[PDB]
């Protein structure tokens, strides 16, 4: 299906069943459906911890590099996975989100302490 413009993108295609998500890393045209036609599969991402307490992520690094070199863009969830893997720098929003959580939890410790101290 020849689209008007568009570009290749490496993004997460949702699979699995209800309450059992499973993502396939695929390089697909920007305008194609999420779970529709793709150019090449570049890995997978199981977001549910397994028996060993691991979230398994497969990355065809040789083919990911090839497609980034051909002008393929990247979705935010895909950029955050490559940041955790050490293939790219940590996406700034993971740093900021981590800092926001630190501040929230620091504020939560005050009320808890006051209750135990005052009462």
């Amino acid at each position: 299906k020849a689209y008007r413009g568009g570009h290749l993108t490496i993004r997460l295609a949702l699979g699995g069943c209800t309450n059992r998500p499973f993502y396939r890393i695929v390089a697909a045209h920007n305008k194609c459906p999420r779970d529709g036609r793709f150019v090449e599969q570049l890995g997978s991402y199981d977001p549910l911890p397994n028996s060993h307490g691991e979230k398994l992520v497969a990355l065809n690094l040789d083919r990911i590099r090839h497609w980034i070199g051909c002008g393929a863009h990247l979705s935010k969830p895909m950029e955050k996975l490559l940041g955790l893997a050490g293939f790219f720098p940590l996406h700034p929003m993971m740093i900021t989100n981590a800092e926001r959580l630190r501040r929230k939890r620091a504020r939560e410790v005050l009320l808890a302490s006051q209750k135990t101290d005052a009462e």
Binding site: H66, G69, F88
Partner: protein, 77 residues
């Protein structure tokens, strides 16, 4: 999803979206991170583009490729 021709909903006629409140300290720190992050990623992207182009050129007119082409011609003759 709606098409350009489909009419706008009546309930949304008066809807006005308000931008979120901006935190000065967080805003500036975040802006720099994007500037650095995108600079590093742009450098990486350039490196990957060069590798792809080199591999294609090597396959087309590489020394090993040309050597094989000459050997094939000699064998035929």
């Amino acid at each position: 999803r709606k098409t350009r021709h489909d009419p706008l909903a009546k309930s949304k006629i008066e809807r006005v979206n308000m931008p979120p409140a901006v935190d000065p300290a967080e805003f500036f720190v975040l802006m720099e991170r994007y500037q650095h992050y995108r600079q590093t990623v742009r450098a990486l992207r350039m490196e990957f583009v060069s590798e792809v182009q080199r591999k294609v050129h090597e396959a087309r007119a590489g020394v090993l490729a040309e050597r094989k082409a000459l050997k094939d011609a000699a064998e035929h003759r």
